[PDB]
Design a protein around this nucleic acid. Structure first.
Ligand code: CS
Ligand code: CS
Ligand code: CS
Ligand code: CS
Ligand code: CS
Ligand code: CS
Ligand code: CS
Ligand code: CS
Lengths: 123, 121
DNA sequence: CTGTTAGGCTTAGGCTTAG
DNA sequence: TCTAAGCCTAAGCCTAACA
């Protein structure tokens, strides 16, 4: 019944969220924890820690639908982007594969599910 | 050049009567009607054979028809029923216009939705 | 298995550009 | 210093199948 107002996700929101995800993945690799950013528990924790104004379910849906397809265009270091693509399970179509290989000077190995199997930093 | 065709008063009358009947049916079924969605207008376009698309209808209803409902050539009982059972905001100016045109006193809530009205006739 | 995580619906809000 | 067809995206939240 209540008429809702909607606030967009900003570029700064994406920078903060992606850096959070990267650091938590690195620490989880050191400690042996498997984090799942496409779940909801990760975003429960993110919302508690950052005290975001947005809900965890909203963050999960948005991350899966908007942030993951746009990760390769983020204003982030290319090594960070490649680590995230390799360790999160983000689809990369053929055209995007070529675009990434060209703009990052890398060699991608992408599977039949279009997930990133591996990469070589050819620089 | 894409020619555009305005919604007519007849379009609005048929759409509002359809919405009224669907609201009555939803009340009897105990379900919530969602005329600002898309499925409702898919069903409407199918039933009425209107030549405009469902997405066009949904946008138009939300943005044009709801703010203009009080000006419709419909019985004020139906207009006030629709205002009461659809999320339609009523600002102070529109509230006064309604009270004068229909000879009623409106009780409008903090969400600027119609709570109730008293017929002064 | 209860968390993950695809996919559906509403409807708020943006773009293009005809009237 | 326009309004709003015509269509769209996606915020926001949800469900449901699979593991
Ligand atoms: Cs914050
Ligand atoms: Cs991957
Ligand atoms: Cs209402
Ligand atoms: Cs599980
Ligand atoms: Cs799943
Ligand atoms: Cs748009
Ligand atoms: Cs116009
Ligand atoms: Cs579902």
């Amino acid at each position: 019944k209540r008429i809702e107002k909607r606030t967009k996700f900003t570029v700064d929101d994406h920078v903060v969220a992606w850096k959070f995800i990267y650091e938590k993945l690195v620490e989880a690799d050191k400690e042996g924890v498997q984090l799942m950013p496409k779940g909801i528990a990760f975003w429960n924790d993110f919302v508690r820690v950052t005290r975001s104004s947005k809900s965890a379910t909203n963050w999960s849906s948005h991350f899966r639908k908007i942030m993951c397809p746009g990760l390769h265009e983020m204003p982030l270091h290319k090594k960070t982007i490649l680590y995230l693509l390799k360790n999160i399970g983000i689809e990369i179509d053929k055209e995007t594969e070529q675009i990434i290989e060209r703009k990052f000077n890398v060699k991608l190995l992408v599977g039949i599910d279009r997930n990133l199997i591996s990469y070589k930093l050819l620089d």
